[PDB]
Design a protein around this motif. Sequence first.
Motif, short mmCIF file in Angstrom:
data_model
loop_
_atom_site.label_atom_id
_atom_site.label_comp_id
_atom_site.label_asym_id
_atom_site.label_seq_id
_atom_site.Cartn_x
_atom_site.Cartn_y
_atom_site.Cartn_z
N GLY B 92 0.53 -1.30 0.14
CA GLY B 92 0.08 0.07 -0.13
C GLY B 92 1.21 1.53 0.14
N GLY B 93 0.78 2.47 -0.91
CA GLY B 93 1.30 3.37 -0.64
C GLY B 93 1.99 3.21 -2.10
N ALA B 94 3.56 3.44 -1.46
CA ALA B 94 4.80 3.33 -2.70
C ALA B 94 6.24 3.68 -2.00
N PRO B 95 6.27 4.20 -0.80
CA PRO B 95 7.81 4.16 -0.66
C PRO B 95 8.38 2.49 0.53
N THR B 96 9.47 2.86 -0.66
CA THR B 96 9.79 1.30 -1.09
C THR B 96 11.39 1.12 -0.52
N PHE B 97 12.20 0.40 0.30
CA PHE B 97 13.64 0.73 1.47
C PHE B 97 13.83 -0.71 1.01
N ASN B 98 14.86 -1.12 0.44
CA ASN B 98 15.83 -2.43 1.54
C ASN B 98 16.38 -2.59 2.32
N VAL B 99 16.40 -3.87 2.82
CA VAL B 99 16.53 -4.48 4.15
C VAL B 99 17.81 -5.44 3.92
N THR B 100 18.84 -5.24 5.03
CA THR B 100 20.02 -6.13 5.05
C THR B 100 19.42 -6.76 6.32
N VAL B 101 19.62 -8.35 7.26
CA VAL B 101 19.83 -8.80 8.29
C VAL B 101 21.28 -9.75 7.59
N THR B 102 22.07 -9.56 8.94
CA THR B 102 23.09 -10.30 9.08
C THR B 102 23.09 -11.19 10.13
N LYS B 103 23.77 -12.25 10.17
CA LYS B 103 23.51 -13.02 11.67
C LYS B 103 24.72 -13.54 12.14
N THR B 104 25.88 -13.63 13.26
CA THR B 104 26.59 -14.12 13.12
C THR B 104 26.35 -15.15 14.33
N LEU B 121 24.94 -1.50 -1.40
CA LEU B 121 24.83 -0.59 -0.35
C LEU B 121 25.48 -0.79 0.89
N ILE B 122 23.62 -1.62 1.05
CA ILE B 122 23.37 -1.76 3.38
C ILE B 122 23.43 -3.47 3.29
N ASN B 123 24.48 -3.65 1.86
CA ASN B 123 24.50 -5.32 2.11
C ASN B 123 25.88 -5.25 2.76
N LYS B 124 26.46 -4.29 1.95
CA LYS B 124 27.68 -4.47 2.28
C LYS B 124 28.77 -4.28 3.90
N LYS B 125 27.44 -2.82 4.37
CA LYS B 125 27.16 -2.29 5.27
C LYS B 125 27.14 -3.27 6.42
N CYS B 126 26.17 -3.70 6.76
CA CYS B 126 25.49 -5.11 7.02
C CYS B 126 26.70 -6.06 7.33
N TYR B 127 26.61 -6.31 6.29
CA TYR B 127 27.95 -7.73 5.66
C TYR B 127 29.64 -7.46 7.64
N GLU B 128 29.99 -6.20 6.75
CA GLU B 128 31.26 -5.99 7.60
C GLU B 128 30.95 -5.67 8.63
N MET B 129 30.08 -5.42 9.64
CA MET B 129 29.86 -4.63 11.40
C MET B 129 29.74 -6.56 11.34
N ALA B 130 28.69 -7.40 10.93
CA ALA B 130 28.64 -8.96 11.54
C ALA B 130 30.08 -9.45 11.43
N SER B 131 31.28 -9.08 9.77
CA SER B 131 32.10 -9.63 10.72
C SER B 131 33.39 -9.33 11.22
#
Lengths: 9, 138
Positions: B92-104, B121-131
Amino acid sequence: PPPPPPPPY
Amino acid sequence: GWNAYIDNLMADGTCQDAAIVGYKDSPSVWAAVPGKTFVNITPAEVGVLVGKDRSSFYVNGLTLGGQKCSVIRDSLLQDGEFSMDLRTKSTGGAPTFNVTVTKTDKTLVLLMGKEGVHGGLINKKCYEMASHLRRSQY
């Protein structure tokens, strides 16, 4: 990421 | 001390939400951006994230903080790439955002980008922190 923070509490 | 990781992930203006959730034993939000979405993640929702059904939330999607998301790519339990990509089901509506869940080992790092931010970009950011987190035994 900075140093590992303490456990939750 | 966890406050600094959220500030870190959000420091470059490309994200609008982030959270570090512990999933072992009793799932709980260790730090999340206030007034947003991930702050309301529930243990039931975390359950689906780390669950056995890896090809069922694919046609029915899932929710994080009440928000319905679409699983676009699932590799959360895959050796090496412990990541999952989702888009925000703006059915519903319009605005869509990309999300990434990373597991440690003990946590799940969640990241939501602002409108128009490239998914990798969101994947890179999320992945490096979990790394960083798993190398520090987290």
